[PDB]
Write a protein that binds this ligand. Structure first.
Ligand SMILES: CC(C)(C)S(=O)(=O)C[C@H](C1CC1)N1C(=O)[C@@](C)(Cc2ncc(CC(=O)O)s2)C[C@H](c2cccc(Cl)c2)[C@H]1c1ccc(Cl)c(F)c1
Length: 105
């Protein structure tokens, strides 16, 4: 991954321009972002990914770093994505799950 700013994370798995897409999170996604310090209603996708990563780590949903699975069936995140678990390595899949929870500007 790459970190172009102190509040953004990017990946070579997704086109660079796509990660600059402006989005307005729906209520659940927005709540998760603000719980780790986000202070706005519109974000670029790379910012959303940063804050959601912060949420995941703060909630201890990725304690086992060598296995690349996030376990979230009992967390708000599981309800948001509609899955009990997912791989942190499958970036298109993650983007897809996030897109379902926002409006693209
Ligand atoms: C290190 C930090 C800057 C704090 S991080 O990158 O934000 C940590 C984070 C951990 C919480 C899951 N994470 C990951 O750990 C990454 C490194 C997971 C991997 N992707 C690919 C890997 C090896 C490979 O190329 O096969 S390892 C990179 C992974 C990532 C980065 C950028 C975009 C996407 Cl879609 C995913 C990132 C992450 C971000 C957000 C969500 Cl919702 C995730 F499920 C995963």
């Amino acid at each position: 991954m790459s970190v172009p700013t102190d509040g953004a994370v990017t990946t070579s798995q997704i086109p660079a321009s796509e990660q600059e897409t402006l989005v307005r999170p729906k209520p659940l996604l927005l709540k998760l972002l603000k719980s780790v310090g986000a202070q706005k209603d519109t974000y670029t996708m790379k910012e959303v990914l940063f804050y959601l990563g912060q949420y995941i780590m703060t909630k201890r949903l990725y304690d086992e770093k060598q296995q690349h699975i996030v376990y979230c069936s009992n967390d708000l995140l599981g309800d948001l994505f509609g899955v009990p678990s997912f791989s942190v390595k499958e970036h298109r899949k993650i983007y897809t799950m996030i897109y379902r929870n926002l409006v693209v500007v």
